[PDB]
Amino acid sequence: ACTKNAIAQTGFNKDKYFNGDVWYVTDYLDLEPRYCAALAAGTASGKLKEALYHYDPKTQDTFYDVSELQVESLGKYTANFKKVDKNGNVKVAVTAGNYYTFTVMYADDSSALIHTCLHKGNKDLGDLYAVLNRNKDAAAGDKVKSAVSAATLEFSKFISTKENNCAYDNDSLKSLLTK
Numbered sequence: 001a002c003t004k005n006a007i008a009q010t011g012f013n014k015d016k017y018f019n020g021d022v023w024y025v026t027d028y029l030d031l032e033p034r035y036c037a038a039l040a041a042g043t044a045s046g047k048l049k050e051a052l053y054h055y056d057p058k059t060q061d062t063f064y065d066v067s068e069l070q071v072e073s074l075g076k077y078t079a080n081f082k083k084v085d086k087n088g089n090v091k092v093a094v095t096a097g098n099y100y101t102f103t104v105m106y107a108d109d110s111s112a113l114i115h116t117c118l119h120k121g122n123k124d125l126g127d128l129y130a131v132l133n134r135n136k137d138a139a140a141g142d143k144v145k146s147a148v149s150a151a152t153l154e155f156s157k158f159i160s161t162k163e164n165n166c167a168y169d170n171d172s173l174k175s176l177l178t179k
């Protein structure tokens, strides 16, 4: 179960974050504990959208999702996901109870700290924090690391994805934003 009400960045710039480009997860902190993950965030016909990519570099399990984000407040969203193939073909339709919340705690032009809480069927899932970068496997800079500290989190507890043999289809993620 999730336990955190993450606070969104003061002065969060939604147009800059939801600009259609890709964000790579470089480090993550699962509160209820080795996938690679990335997302594109953008707008399509005035709707906030995210496309997600998960890849397990050991098992090869790979899945994509597309979501419309509903606004709770600035920087805090609720997203109903549909599982799709890389082309946007629907594999699992949207259903109530399958959603995640998404809070942007810090963002700038190259980096971000987010919180997400996943709800899926009758599964019991926990909070996840992620450090994001515009560049694949980029080392976390001082701004986002300071934001981790300011959120009262210990960055040394995060797990890096940078040393995983991961590959990302950024072209598919960007194209999925319209799906």
Ligand code: HEM
Pocket (backbone or CB within 6 Å): 025, 028, 034, 035, 036, 037, 039, 052, 054, 063, 064, 065, 081, 082, 083, 092, 099, 100, 102, 116, 118, 120, 123, 128, 130, 161
């Ligand atoms: C490296 C960081 C992450 C790891 C290790 C990770 C891990 C996982 C795992 C293991 C599952 C399978 C859950 C299950 O069905 O048992 C999953 C599903 C999911 N995750 Fe993540 N995740 C990460 C980042 C994210 C982020 C940042 C988001 C949202 C922005 C997200 C959203 C989702 C969604 C929506 C599903 C369900 C997709 C579906 O069933 O169609 N994940 N993740």
